[PDB]
Amino acid sequence: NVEFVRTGYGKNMVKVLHIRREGNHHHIIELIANVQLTLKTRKDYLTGDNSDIIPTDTVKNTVHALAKLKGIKSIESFALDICEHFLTAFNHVTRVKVNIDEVPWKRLEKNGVEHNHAFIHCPEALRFCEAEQYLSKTPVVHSGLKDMKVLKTTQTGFEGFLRDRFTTLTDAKDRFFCTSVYARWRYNTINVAFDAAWKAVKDTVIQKFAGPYDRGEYSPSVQKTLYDTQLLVLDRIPEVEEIEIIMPNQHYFVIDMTKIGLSNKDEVYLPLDNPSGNITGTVCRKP
Amino acid sequence: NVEFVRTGYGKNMVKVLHIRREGNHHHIIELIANVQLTLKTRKDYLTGDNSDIIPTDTVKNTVHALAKLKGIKSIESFALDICEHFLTAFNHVTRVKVNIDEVPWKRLEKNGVEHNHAFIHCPEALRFCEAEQYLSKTPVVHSGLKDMKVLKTTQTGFEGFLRDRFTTLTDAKDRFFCTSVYARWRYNTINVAFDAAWKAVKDTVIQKFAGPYDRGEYSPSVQKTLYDTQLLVLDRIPEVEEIEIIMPNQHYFVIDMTKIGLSNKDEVYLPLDNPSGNITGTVCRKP
Amino acid sequence: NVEFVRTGYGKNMVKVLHIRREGNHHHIIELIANVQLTLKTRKDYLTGDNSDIIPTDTVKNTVHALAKLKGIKSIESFALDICEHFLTAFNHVTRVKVNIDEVPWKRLEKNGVEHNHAFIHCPEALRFCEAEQYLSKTPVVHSGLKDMKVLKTTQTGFEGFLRDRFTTLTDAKDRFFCTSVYARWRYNTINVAFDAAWKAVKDTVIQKFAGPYDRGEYSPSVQKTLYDTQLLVLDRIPEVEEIEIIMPNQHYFVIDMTKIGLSNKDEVYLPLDNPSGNITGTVCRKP
Amino acid sequence: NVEFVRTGYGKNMVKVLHIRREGNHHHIIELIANVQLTLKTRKDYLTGDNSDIIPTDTVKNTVHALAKLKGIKSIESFALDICEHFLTAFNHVTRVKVNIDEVPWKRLEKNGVEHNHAFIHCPEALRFCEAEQYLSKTPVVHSGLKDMKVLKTTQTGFEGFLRDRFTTLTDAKDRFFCTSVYARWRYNTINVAFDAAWKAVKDTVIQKFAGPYDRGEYSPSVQKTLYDTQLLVLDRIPEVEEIEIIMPNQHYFVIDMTKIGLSNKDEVYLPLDNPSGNITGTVCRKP
């Protein structure tokens, strides 16, 4: 009658912070990790036989443990070590997937001197990764950024679109563009400078969204902005193979005041939570 | 150079309530809808051409319009109307995907008597669905439930698991099982009694988790509970082809008070948010 | 120099579940507890002297232990027991304040048959309380409800209001009224059937809001419905001395469709999250 | 029977962005506003008489219109204008309280240059205010910061506390301190440089929390750090009259790994959400 398409289990929301003291200067990294395992045997699902179960409490313990043993250089390398452990320290685990979120701790700073041990929370963008590996295979790593809220107040338009029966929207020479960018890309090798590449992607995203800093750059189409960014990432980082981007369109509308006898010449805007535009795209290297 | 692997765009978070009134006896449905279109041309991405763009504001107007023209029998059939509209009122749309959540309104009820026009918000579980359709192919509907938080204070155990360097957990005959169930199923056909189906899946999950009101039912691994309910769903509902279940294990630990000279005989427990067990499974019919 | 206006410290977010095993029949209560203490000494703030500090860990430990020792009948009596503890088992404590939220567990019920040990989450309204006590004084307790989202589709209207130069709203004999009621009452005595008192308040609010399940009741202003609800609580529950009510007005606007060539005569509604009407009032007995 | 204690009504979550274009340089402020009015007449509650009601929709429009008409220079100035209007344009209004939250837009900046029209979201700390005014009387302005998450990995301890039967905590010379500062102060005059005052208070808080960026400062008690911060606020900003500070203690615990045969030598920490220490205080100038 039935057949397994997919199985997995583990422990989620494992929070951990690791510290590396070199002199008075403390290095910290705090992350929330989830690990999923796939077992060779399915006798746990079929007959309630636990003899193959590495308890989720043990998965928790292992994540804590590897953190002491391997230390934590990046969430991507940590994810890779979790993968390697469960694949090598056992023989009945066929797949392991680690997805990690990083807590965006920034070193406290006043005018170019950096506190040795104090940190502030300024999530410009949130960083995450994934590592997936099949038994004795070459593992695959994804990295990405999320919740990077940016706003432009000009140098965007939306004209030359299809009218149908339901279109009411007129051409717009000029209008605000606000988004909360999600980006996620696959590396074609494990051998990457991860903190450097992540920064590079982030910088590319903001720069092609905003710059040049004086007059900005006109963008006719959110689709095109998104795409040009996918091309600029693929030029700057040979180790990124595929990249995905999602950009919500968070709307700011000039509030029409004439029914109350005033003229609003593009001064007061309504920020509107719902609904929102959504523009997506995934491109990869021509193999 | 590069190649597109995937594109899409549309409007997310489109809220709507449709009402149908028979004098003083009113019937309502409220939902939040997201729609995505894929276009044959990518000239929007490549060059910034807006020639083929249906504006997201139009998607919004359309969702609104179809609620009036078509009415809303269920979140599923509404989803199917949207898919079919964008595939047939246009030539250049290759695929449409709509994901919708139902705002869980329950009619006000006291001792058998039901109110003609008043509602309370008592979400047992939240209803959702997706309909994905390619041009000139048959549309595919997924339906599901989420955030169904249930608790069992006994009739659960977990013994005979594997021990490694990192195991600290001791066998347990009896323990709390708390979860917040998420399920997703692909229908094999468009011809379904949607309301009755969704309820039947829910009642199945609740009845198998709880067992008889009299004595309960013992479960020795949540994986088996998961697997049993999948099978039970594939018996109860023919038009369900595949079913995925995620069961979190949101923990309740007996507080040890010996360090404060009291002996806690399983009376007072600590609800702990993080981390949580997570047990997943995805089973389809053997063709 | 300066003067203290108020001090306190304590533990917040102390999550706890208490079980009473009455045969096969389990009684559950889960709450989130916050406890604050004021001290006779301010040498804590002044010079950093900790000798009078009950550590925050200890106040956590105490809440746990009191749950074992005193048991938990209702969130109120528990608050009161926490209060009395801190004031009688110490000497330098001038004031204690306990605010707790109840986790809305509802015993599974098939059709009159109640499960011995299974429970589902149904956040109909959320129960909370506060008990505050000064040393050697009789304590003060508030109880209340929040997040009771209720909707009525007719039997509400709003006409004959002040029109000024900024007003655009037109008269309406009939419109939706959706709120998420918040209520908070003080008792005149420690000696109340708290569970019962709570139920009756809730039943009153839902009742005056919905009226007869058959014909409804016309409400010409939410102010008036708010006031009528207050008075009803005060007749039904002699031990309530003062009652506050917050009623948001969560709007559902008829979607005008003339610009797209349809006549949506009150079928399709746009639920709007923001902004929202807010209507408040606090009434007490003529002392 | 009964007598009123307190009444009030208005509009909540009124979102607004105001833009000012001086050449290529664009300036924005985005905020979210709540307005409550009290009336002389109570006929609205008593009998459902609306003749004195300024409709909530009008309050929304008033807020929009005032943004255009008066401009928005700071959230507090805007609050005052809203107060002013409803008290002077009308007769029957006895009180107006306005509460505003600011959306933390920060101008995007790279390599010594600042973008003329691009912004990013960095909630280092979140700004808010209140202005409340009675008819013909002087208005009162409170301002505040919130969700300022700061973390230090050393230079904090807790020893010399009171011991009781429910105490297990031991003396601790050195530990992490992570908090999320909330502070709210009343001004003794409405005549203040709001943007700089705000900024000074913020900097004082991070300042006194971190100590020197070299060695930090040993802190023995958060009550002292609290009080110490309060006094430096009062001394540096003569126009703040009263200051409230709430500091949670969000715990980072050393993970004991000896049960798995490992020495965690203060390298790996568990971040705990719940429960949290909590330390509050409100000091003012002596009249």
Numbering used by the authors:
A (entry chain D), B (entry chain C), C (entry chain A), D (entry chain B): 8 to 294
Quote the study on this structure.
Urate oxidase (uricase, Uox) catalyses hydroxylation of urate to give 5-hydroxyisourate (HIU). This is the first and rate-limiting step of uricolysis, a three-step enzymatic pathway present in both prokaryotes and eukaryotes that converts urate into the more soluble (S)-allantoin. The oldest known structure of the enzyme is a tetramer of the tunnelling (T) fold domain able to catalyse urate oxidation without the help of cofactors. The zebrafish (Danio rerio) urate oxidase (chr11: 8151055.8158017) encodes a protein of 298 aa with a C-terminal tripetide (ARM) corresponding to the type 1 peroxisome-targeting signal.
The crystal structure of DrUox was obtained at 2.8 Å resolution with a continuous electron density from Gly8 to Pro294. The DrUox structure shows the typical T-fold with a homotetramer organized as a dimer of dimers joining head-to-head to form the functional tetramer. Each monomer contains two tandem repeats of the T-fold domain forming an antiparallel β8-sheet with four main α-helices located at the concave side of the sheet. The active sites (four in the tetramer) are located at the dimerization interfaces. In the crystal structure, chains A-C and B-D at the tetramer interface are connected by a disulfide bond involving Cys129, a residue not conserved in Uox sequences. The geometrical parameters of the disulfide, classify it as having a Left-Handed Staple conformation (+LHStaple), a rare bond characterized by a high strain energy. Phenylalanine 216, a residue strictly conserved in Uox alignment, is not part of the tetramer interface, but establishes main chain and side chain interaction with lysine 158 of the tetramer interface.
